[model samples]
Target: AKLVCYFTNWAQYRQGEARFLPKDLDPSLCTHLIYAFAGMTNHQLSTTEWNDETLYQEFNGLKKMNPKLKTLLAIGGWNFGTQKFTDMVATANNRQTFVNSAIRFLRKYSFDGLDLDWEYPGSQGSPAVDKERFTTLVQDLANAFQQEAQTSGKERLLLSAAVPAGQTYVDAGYEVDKIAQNLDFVNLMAYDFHGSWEKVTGHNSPLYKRQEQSGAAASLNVDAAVQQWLQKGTPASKLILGMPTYGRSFTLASSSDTRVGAPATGSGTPGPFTKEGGMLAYYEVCSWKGATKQRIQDQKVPYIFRDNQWVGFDDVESFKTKVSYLKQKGLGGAMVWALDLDDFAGFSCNQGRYPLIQTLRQEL
Candidate 1:
């Protein structure tokens, strides 16, 4: 199984906390580690000060701990939107420019591959033609990578894309069969089905579909998504399911209303560690004091409610179940949204460092 984990570049600057650096990684836990983001400037790859060339070297140097481990550079993220990618993939010349830049950047940094993290293609304010253009981009990239491998007599580098899990997303952004044909594998962003955006509380990454709701998001759970992709022709062996190491927090409208879909005034305050409003790191949720937990059977997930605040997240139990699901589904493997979000220091949770990830390793 290919266990891919994302390592955020900015996790080192979490002030007043144990910062997560490349050196802190347990490379043995993951087969591939993808750097969260390296931006685009004038349609070329670039990095900010936080992820400068020096840091890139240190990050790739992590292979020393596990020689078989591979590293990838994930370009684009939610913050990047889709404008740059839309512009670059519009035409043949622009696509070539990006392919060349990717090859050059990968060789210079000694990265094993590139992961395209375009949030969405035709949607996200991009042109409708983005769907076709995205396919072209992958095809061109595959061709360039093949030619480069032939010239250098080196193994072809891996090329993968992080795709949206919702069926609506598939219709709007992808031509699944063609996309699958041109790349190494597809990473399904199977989490984030529900968050603070809604007034009602729901699981952030439910494994099954809840019968309680009916709408576009009702079919957004992981199982339906994986099936949709398979039905659309993406090989199960090339599909990697994503697991989140964080929780979505919500503020209950009334302390008495503690059930699922309970009315919520708004998102809960961010934990001291994660610092993002309406969210908490797995470590924070793990160590939360006096929180009452409940399991939602239909979704096969759990949540914690304490003092009018609700947080939905995963633990070792849920992770093991998810991994078992991956094995049952004939999937390529599983991936974590990020590495640093877990209790990597063993300072919190008390279960040991990387308890959630460790469970995944054991199950796989």
Candidate 2:
């Protein structure tokens, strides 16, 4: 089976505006292209208005490249503000209100699917809400999406989500097994496992934790994450392991620090600091001399050293290994956080620039 490649919808199209569709996009190998964060989600407040026309153009362009590609519209994100969701899911009345809005908004844009990016289903963030409502919300959305599609005589538009990787994020709010049965699948945000927020630095996204930890084995990486959810009742067919196109960086505490273990502060978030607020638009950190690594005994992910700077990111080898693992697991294929990060020019390691995507396609 082919792997799933979901581009985060947070920036590309909002309300209806087209923000970041690459002119030189290649969709031949991908099954779907997502126009991220369609609702008034994320931190920019009201700046990026939604534009249906822009999304239509992008969807059309993607079809031109790979006519089989499915385009989806995603809603809610880290910055969608919990406040809005409170009323939207506060009660039956509110949940139904949201249902109508979601349906109307999606139909207005002619989206092929809807990806709910509620950042946190149970925990409270900007809106400061309750944890229990998440399950109900997911269930309701599944019912609504499926019902509407059937009534309209359209193959159900895709309904998926960007799920949190940490056990807490899953347990606190999501009923994975319940929602999986209703929707198509879940996009597990398996990367960003380690970042500046860590008091101890580690690989941002390790393909596997070579050493054992707790009850989990050392082979744990994105594959393990999906397996964990599947074991909990979600079907293996309805899971998509997430891969990040960008790497996170930190300023080492001292010059001698060559590993990712030493605690370092992040200068900024990966995507926001870049031109499109997505990490792929920036230059490669792999070529930087300071990037170095030492495998974390427990995390299994590699860390990089580049002079006074330290970064934790996945390289081609890691990417290839991950693709193999996913296929072996018999789970749905991988989904990248974004695409622009793919090696556009054969410049980076000279070994091969688009090595990651090429490897992914070859494996599929």
Candidate 3:
């Protein structure tokens, strides 16, 4: 089973103790480390961070410690949006331009592959046409990878993507059968099923449906999402189950009614480290002082609350269950949404460094 860990570029710029450098990564912990992200410019691949080159060198340097480790560069996060990708895939010339630049860029950085994280091609302001364009880009990149391998004799760069789990996005954005044949794998973004955008409190990535959930609500869980991808034509081995190292938080509307479906006014206070309203990293979730912790037995995940701050997150216990599910279903492997968000520094959670990610590694 592959343990694909995502390490973000902006993490090093974080305040104080939160800043995470590539050196902090445990070389043996994850099989594949994906750097997110590299930006696009004029239909060509570009760097988003000032020291991306330096970071790239240092990040790939981990291969020295673990010769088996593979690294990939991811492009297009939620904030990166679909406009840039839209422009790059609008025409055959543009797609080829982007593809050629991507080859040169990945080769320059010594990355093993590229992970497309365009959020979704046909959703989030992207046109419906982008769905087919996405397939074209994949097919183009796949052929280029083979040609480069055959000509330059370097190992063929693996192709994969961080894809949406929602039914609407999956149906609208992908040509599953074609991609399954061309790409190396698909990292199914099975989390973020719920967040502060909704008034009712909910788990960020429940392992199973709540007993009372029905219809559309019933599908908002890890089990259903995986089934959706498999049923939709993505082979089980080609799907990497995404696990969140962070949790969504909410300010409870009624402290007396603190349950999965409890009413909530808005986002809870940001974590001391992540500093994002409505959410907290796994470390912050564990660090929440005097937080009351509970488990949704059927869902197989846990949550913690203190005062009015309610946080839904994954932990070692949950990772075990999730991994068992992964193995049972013959899925490819587990993908940690990110490495930094976990308790990479042992102090915050009082567990070993990267407890959540480490647990996934141990379980796998």
Candidate 4:
């Protein structure tokens, strides 16, 4: 089973107590470590941070302590969007330009693979053809990886991609059969299902939709997402379930109404550590004072609230249930949205370092 954990670039820039460095990572914690982002410069692969190459050295160096570990570089995250992806794959030559450079880029960084984090190619300012375009990109990239591997007699580079959890986005964006055939893993982004963006509070990533949920709401869940992917073309063996290391927060429209569907005015107050309104790192959630905790029945996830402040996140018990669910479903393994956002130091959660991910590893 594969246990993939993402490491973000900006976490290094966070202040004081919230700051995290690559050194904080336990090499044995995850089977794979994906560096959150690198960018594209004029359709050519480019490093994101000023010291990215140096960081790459340190990040991949973790493998020295655990030789079984794999390191991959992810490109085209949310901020980078689908524009560049659209341009890069618009022509076969352009696709070749990117993939060719990508091969060199990964080799130079000592990375074992590349993760395409392109957000939604067919939807979000794209045409239907963009869907087919993405599949070709994956196919082209995979073919090149194979060609390089055989010619060079070096280890073949790995490939994986982040996929949407919502059925809307999944239908709008992906050509599942081709993507599944080409990529090594399908990282289902099962969180962010609901947040401050909605009119009512909802689980960030519920295991299953509530009985009362109807229509679109019925399809908004980890189980539904996984089933849809399986239904489309992807096999369970290649599907890595995404687990969150943070919570999505929201402000209750009224303190008197505090259930899952309670009216939410907008984003909640930013957390002390994460410092992002509408989001709280798991460590910060543990640090929240006087908050009341409750689990959603059947959904099997927990949420906390203090007056109007609310957050939906996975804790240890919740993590256990999800892992159990995945195992029973015969899925490939778990993938944490990140390793940095979890209680890696175990200062707040206190279970142990990397408790959430640790639980997943143990369950696997």
TM-scores for all candidates: the values are: 0.98, 0.82, 0.99, 0.98
* Candidate 3 residue-wise lDDT, 1-364, digit = tens: 8999999999998787778999889999999999999999899988999999999999998988898999999999999989989888889899989999999999998999999999879999999999999999999999999999899999899899999888889889898888888889889898998899999999999999999999999999999999988987888998899999999999999778889989999998988878889888887787777778999887999998888878899999989999999999999999988888998889788888999998988899
Q: Which stretches of candidate 3 lie over 4 Å from their true place?
A: none
Write one digit per residue (lDDT tens) for candidate 4, span 280-325.
Answer: 9999899877889999996899999998899999998988998888
Which regions in candidate 2 have their CA more than 4 angstroms from the true location? 8-22, 41-47, 50-52, 126-132, 210-224, 265-282, 287-301, 345-354
RMSD in angstroms between candidate 4 and the native structure over all alpha carbons: 0.9
Model 2 residue 284 CA deviation (Å) reads 2.6
Please report, in order, the local distance difference test score of every candidate based on alpha carbons.
0.88, 0.62, 0.91, 0.90
Question: How many clashing residue pairs, candidate 3?
Answer: 0
Tens-place lDDT digits, model 1, residues 40-97: 9877888866556877899888887678989899999998899999999987788878
- Which order, best to worst by lDDT? 3, 4, 1, 2
| Cα misplacement distance, residue 145 of candidate 2 (Å) | 2.8
| Higher-scoring candidate on lDDT, 2 or 4 | 4
List the RMSD of every prediction in angstroms. 1.1, 4.8, 0.8, 0.9
* Candidate 2: RMSD to truth: 4.8
**Deviation in Å, model 4, residue 138 alpha carbon:** 0.2
Lowest summed lDDT across 10 adjacent residues in model 2 is found at: 273-282
